[PDB]
């Protein structure tokens, strides 16, 4: 069958849009991510999500943002969506000042750790490098 | 009668494990560009898993890197669905 989607609210959509990093880090400013973050906002608004844009967070504001969202009462929402736009590498997202483990962010939403979301679809859209291999195509 | 704790997560990566992810400096990233378009087009006709498959085909077939750096030029991208869902997911009624 299908997940239940006839709850009162469709659910939260968190967009974390990091485009400017600290100089001490030496990764580039990510141009166009605003175009991304705005496209996301409009699309999920049409899917009836309570969209929340956040911009340029430290690796610690990210953890703490996510922890707060994990302890909200989701009992009347159908699903949960998170989008992350940033630099990365396999298993790792970059706050504005350095890396965060992906499993750390997601662990707040485990079945034992976020009861009001147990049994409900938790979606995670990640725009970030997962390393440094290049695909040269074929044909 | 319980369920696994990692169950009902979905991970929609923009790219395969170990690889660069491509973004356009004016138009935004290939993946989010293609995701929003496919969601606009098909979320009242198609189950999510199939939408992301279309998103895979859009990125796969229609995008190719353009760089003044021959190292990063003419390169491709395949996105990576990682589904631990347990039901189908529809956005309409």
């Amino acid at each position: 069958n299908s997940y239940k989607m006839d709850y009162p609210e469709m659910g939260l959509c968190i967009i974390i849009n990091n485009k400017n990093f600290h100089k001490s880090t030496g990764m580039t400013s990510r141009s166009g991510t605003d175009v991304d973050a705005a496209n996301l906002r409009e699309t999920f608004r049409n899917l009836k999500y309570e969209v929340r844009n956040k911009n340029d967070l430290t690796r610690e504001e990210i953890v703490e943002l996510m922890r707060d969202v994990s302890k909200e009462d989701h009992s009347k929402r159908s699903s949960f969506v998170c989008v992350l736009l940033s630099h990365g590498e396999e298993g790792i997202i970059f706050g504005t000042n350095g890396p965060v483990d992906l499993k750390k962010i997601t662990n707040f939403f485990r079945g034992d750790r976020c009861r009001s979301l147990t049994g409900k679809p938790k979606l995670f859209i990640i725009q970030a490098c997962r390393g440094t291999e290049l695909d040269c195509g074929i044909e | 009668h319980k369920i696994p704790v990692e169950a009902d997560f979905l991970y929609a990566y923009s790219t395969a494990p170990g690889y660069y992810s491509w973004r356009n400096s004016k138009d935004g990233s290939w993946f989010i560009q293609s995701l929003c378009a496919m969601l606009k087009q098909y979320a009242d006709k198609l189950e999510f898993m199939h939408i992301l498959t279309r998103v895979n085909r859009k990125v796969a077939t229609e995008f190719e890197s353009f760089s003044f750096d021959a190292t990063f030029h003419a390169k491709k991208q395949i996105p990576c669905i990682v589904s631990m869902l347990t039901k189908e997911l529809y956005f309409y009624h």
Binding site: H87, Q127, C129 | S21, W22, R23, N24, S25, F66, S67
Partner: peptide, 5 residues
Amino acid sequence: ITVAD
């Protein structure tokens, strides 16, 4: 032009 994330 297209850049790496």
